[PDB]
Point group: C2
Chain length 282, copies 2
Amino acid sequence: MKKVFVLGAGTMGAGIVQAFAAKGCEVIVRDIKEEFVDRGIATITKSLSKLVAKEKITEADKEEILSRISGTTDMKLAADCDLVVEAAIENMKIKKEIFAELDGICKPETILASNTSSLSITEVASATKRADKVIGMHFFNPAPVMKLVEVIRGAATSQETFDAVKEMSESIGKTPVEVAEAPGFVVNRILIPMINEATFILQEGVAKEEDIDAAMKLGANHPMGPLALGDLIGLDVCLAIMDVLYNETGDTKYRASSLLRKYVRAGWLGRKTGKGFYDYSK
Amino acid sequence: MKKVFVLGAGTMGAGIVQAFAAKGCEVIVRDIKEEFVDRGIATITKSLSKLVAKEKITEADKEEILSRISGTTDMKLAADCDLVVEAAIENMKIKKEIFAELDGICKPETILASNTSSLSITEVASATKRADKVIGMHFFNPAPVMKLVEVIRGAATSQETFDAVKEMSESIGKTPVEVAEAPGFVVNRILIPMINEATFILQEGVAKEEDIDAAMKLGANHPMGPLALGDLIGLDVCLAIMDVLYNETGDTKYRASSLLRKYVRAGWLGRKTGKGFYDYSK
């Protein structure tokens, strides 16, 4: 594949744009307003400038990557792309509208993928006449840096679609893993209940925040403690993922702690609000 | 403190002897047979030789460290130790017997600590007349290298006993964290259920073994994948810990997968048997 269309110019969409462009794909990024598209382009540009200051890439590299990326508000520009990656809002009614629309717009060959963490690819696929070509392609923040892509097969995703996405991931220097669609896939199903267990430990007076996090770093060689990780991911995101696991499975194993729900209610969402488990600033 | 008594000359007990002796403590290591004791000292000697191999210590350091260590099969040699670290079998009736005996032998000041992962410090303490001086001092394999010590306070453990163990930890170069006794303390409570979650993901056809492990390493920056980690820790030990968490809490959240139970029943315990989730060799 050579031409990729990414919907959404928020943080993840822009990061995924960069992941593809950095390895020589031609990428079109679409959002709903012209200043959203611009915001995402400036997001990629700052991120490349950081890469230059670190002497990871040259200033020429920066401009070359930028040269492969174009913004638009026009969905009809997907028509000729080989892959679409949707990174827009985590809402099933809207995803089904988006994918139905893309199904109408795009050549038969085009594979339609979602970066969704929490909605069913199978259900989204069912809103198209191309279920065999609908698939999850789940990146991790920061998408240019994190090597994993979870390639999530819906019930109807064909082997051919899976192979092509596996191939594409490898072409952009990523490691794809095959996931049969289930709640949380692999990474979040393991990781978010880890953070949630850390909140239970806190709520039950077992240890204090800094001690929980130093335990996991120094006892398990984790790169970050789970409370700090939660503040990085966003406690709202963590809470939402635990609620999804619980709703999907019906299994009280995945019940969020009350303390986590209280923090989210306070708007103590972690780094992005300046306060979660820890107090940050700006 | 100058003198430490360690029960158990297997791999943990030997690592712990080494962690104390390398930092200037006299250590007496006790096990129920002389070849066990001999194997422990053999282990420590290997490890130090390899430190010498890699030029992190001189061969004179090595000798000086070994000359601080003596072996025995007689519990009565604990009498003059300032601290006892019990790293012996994970059975309550027998822990209680060890601690009751140690209580009769040791001078009044000796702190009696257990390296237990899975039994109650409180319940052990209650078999002594010195519950104020009974505590958990929980090291991580390899004890010479891993910085964390979980310092587990039983219901009756005094502040003075806690502070002394905190200071001892810092004196041997470790980072202590305060834990109020509860199932799995901090580390294992978070870590082992992650491993068990990987085994469910495997059991449920979600992804295969290597993809599960690549996901956690490349998606969450973990130093090892959870299944490989289970093989390192030992699947028997993983299952035991999930069973303690479940039996202690009555919470189905901590139920072991059937798949984990079956591997343990097969003797596919991990690296130590040449086969767990993966096959090993030589």
